[PDB]
């Protein structure tokens, strides 16, 4: 429902985009569990069509051919092993549920699928489910191309085909039931909740009808009254017919205005300044905090022409991406999702990356394992932003401050700002083109604190910058606009 169902005191999830199940299981044990991560959003676990032109794009995973748990990430036994191993170290699994459609209406008939199931897209045949012609919306679409021609018409957005994908007749109980049996199988395996893909393309009541069929979570890992966490992917930046509020009664909704506006402010575009973030959250017109799933970027818009366009910050803009993710993880608004990506061979032509369809690192189509090096970074083209010290330590900061109110805001009237969370954490940012040198009230008890952005508290010492907070809570902050990271963060568990 609205509660994430993470283990108590864990406050973020990470999207391990296109990772294989065996690698995620290992990552839960060696890293996510010990480092306090709440959970992992996984790529669609159900069987999809194989796209050979272009060669195995990441987007083929959003074109279902059955609900069998067999993909390039692994098979059902590997998926079950991952969910168990992660739940056992306190890390939940959330599934990307692709339920609005099946594969492209133009895909060829046959067994060119990730588990070898047969399908005949042209004749609306999906025997592995099973689905047939009457289970799709072709008869409802009022457009001439069969596609969505105007986003100011909710009926075409919900009933017509999204980029040529066969649109499921979600008002039918048979269809609502096939989808629920799939989600309930995942709940039985131990999943904690779901990202409902392409929610704007479904009627609010049809999604609720499917949700009404879901069981409570598995009692080997969750208390008996527990409803699955639901976050609906609705892209609503304003100025269109469909609003994110239409879905609030079903569960949380992705707040895409968050990353779009934060990226514009952090880049200092369109006259925006960091000092304007004093009233960040509902004051900027966003949805209620208790209904929001927030993030700086996602797998679609980190490619540059998604929701937010070029203002979206990504790992390619690492210096500013870290400050945006750090501000997000320190601020109380919303439930936070961090991104973990792969690097692809970009190829710009006339200013555009024509290679943005490229799928995960692979050897002849088999996804590469995630290798871990000693500096704790990753190999094999995986970026592993969730392992960057500055992000890992801020997800720990958000756990440490859980519940504490936004407090002690300061700004220099331009792009230097700071704020705390009750008496448990404080963060300071310098996004101006000059030195930050200020005495600030931190709200924290006096002591010597390790800055968790530049280092870590190890034993009774700090490996980075030390911040000396006096008994009245004040501390001297000095941050160069050219520092490795132009922000500092300290909290109760970083005190010596």
């Amino acid at each position: 429902q609205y509660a994430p169902q993470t283990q108590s005191g864990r406050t973020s999830i990470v999207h391990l985009f296109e990772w294989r199940w065996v690698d995620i299981a290992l990552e839960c044990e060696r890293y996510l569990g010990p480092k306090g991560f709440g959970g992992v959003q996984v790529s669609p676990p159900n069987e999809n069509i194989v796209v050979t032109n272009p060669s195995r794009p990441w987007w083929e995973r959003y074109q279902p051919v059955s609900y069998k748990l067999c993909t390039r990430s692994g098979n059902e036994n590997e998926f079950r092993d991952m969910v168990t191993r992660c739940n056992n170290v306190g890390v939940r699994i959330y599934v990307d549920a692709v339920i609005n459609h099946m594969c492209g209406s133009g895909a060829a008939a046959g067994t060119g699928t990730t588990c070898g199931s047969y399908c005949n897209p042209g004749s609306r045949e999906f025997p592995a489910v099973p689905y047939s012609a009457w289970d799709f919306n072709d008869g409802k679409c009022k457009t001439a191309s069969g596609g969505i021609e105007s986003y100011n018409d909710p009926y075409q957005v919900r009933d017509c085909q999204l980029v040529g994908l066969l649109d499921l007749a979600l008002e039918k109980d048979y269809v609502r039931s096939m989808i629920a049996d799939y989600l309930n199988k995942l709940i039985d395996i131990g999943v904690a909740g779901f990202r409902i893909d392409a929610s704007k393309h479904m009627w609010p009541g049809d999604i609720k009808a499917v949700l009404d069929k879901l069981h409570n979570l598995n009692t080997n890992w969750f208390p008996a009254g527990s409803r699955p966490f639901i976050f609906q992917e609705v892209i609503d930046l304003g100025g269109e017919a469909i609003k994110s509020s239409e879905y609030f009664g079903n569960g949380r909704v992705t707040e895409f205005k968050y990353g779009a506006k934060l990226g514009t402010v952090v880049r200092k575009w369109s006259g925006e300044k960091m000092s304007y973030l004093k009233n960040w959250g509902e004051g900027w017109g966003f949805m209620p905090s208790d209904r929001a799933l927030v993030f700086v970027d996602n797998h679609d818009n980190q490619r540059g022409h998604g929701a937010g366009g070029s203002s979206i910050l990504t790992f390619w803009d690492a210096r500013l991406y870290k400050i945006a993710v750090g501000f997000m993880l320190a601020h109380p608004y919303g439930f936070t999702r961090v991104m973990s990506s792969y690097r692809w061979a970009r190829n710009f032509v006339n200013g555009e990356d024509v290679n943005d369809w490229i799928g995960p690192p692979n050897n002849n189509g088999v996804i590469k394992e995630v290798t871990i090096n000693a500096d704790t970074t990753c190999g094999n083209d995986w970026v592993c932003e969730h392992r960057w010290r500055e992000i890992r330590n801020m997800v720990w900061f958000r756990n440490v401050v859980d519940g504490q109110p936004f407090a002690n805001w300061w700004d220099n009237g331009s792009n230097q700002v700071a704020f705390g969370r009750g008496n448990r954490g404080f963060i300071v940012f310098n996004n101006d083109d000059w030195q930050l040198s200020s005495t600030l009230q931190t709200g924290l008890p006096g002591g010597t604190y390790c800055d968790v952005i530049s280092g870590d508290k190890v034993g009774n010492s700090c490996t980075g910058i030390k911040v000396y907070v006096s008994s009245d809570g004040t501390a001297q902050f000095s941050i160069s606009n050219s520092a490795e990271d132009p922000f500092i963060a300290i909290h109760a568990e970083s005190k010596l």
Epitope: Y155, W203, G205, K243, S245, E246, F248, G249
Partner: nanobody, 119 residues
């Protein structure tokens, strides 16, 4: 189907008002209801909503002071606003959202709203 909004007025801080919203004329249609408000110079922001199953959502600034409920009949809702503060002053708009698509159930556009002035 027509959108009918009512209840606006001027009360002093601490007073109450109750807004009403109805999307009547075709009982086969089902509309979920959500109120937004626009103060001069601010944007039109969500404040409270309720779906057909009675599930409520409130923005934090009105929690415990505003109560949204299903009205007299299907496709009707009320927004009981108590302990009004001067910052609650704004033009309020009910936006009915179609819950299920059906032949001849229209999408309803923003209406004119109602004016609420506190103090």
């Amino acid at each position: 189907v027509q959108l009918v909004e009512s209840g606006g007025g001027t009360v002093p801080a601490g007073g109450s008002l109750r807004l009403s919203c109805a999307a009547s004329g075709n009982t086969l249609c089902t509309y979920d209801m959500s109120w937004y408000r626009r103060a001069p110079g601010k944007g039109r922001d969500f404040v409270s909503g309720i779906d057909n199953d009675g599930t409520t959502t409130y923005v934090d600034s009105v929690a415990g002071r505003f109560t949204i409920s299903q009205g007299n009949a299907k496709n009707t809702a009320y927004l009981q606003m108590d302990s009004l503060k001067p910052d609650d002053t704004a033009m309020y708009y009910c936006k009915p959202s179609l819950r299920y698509g059906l032949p001849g159930c229209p999408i309803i556009p923003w209406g004119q709203g109602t004016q609420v002035t506190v103090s």
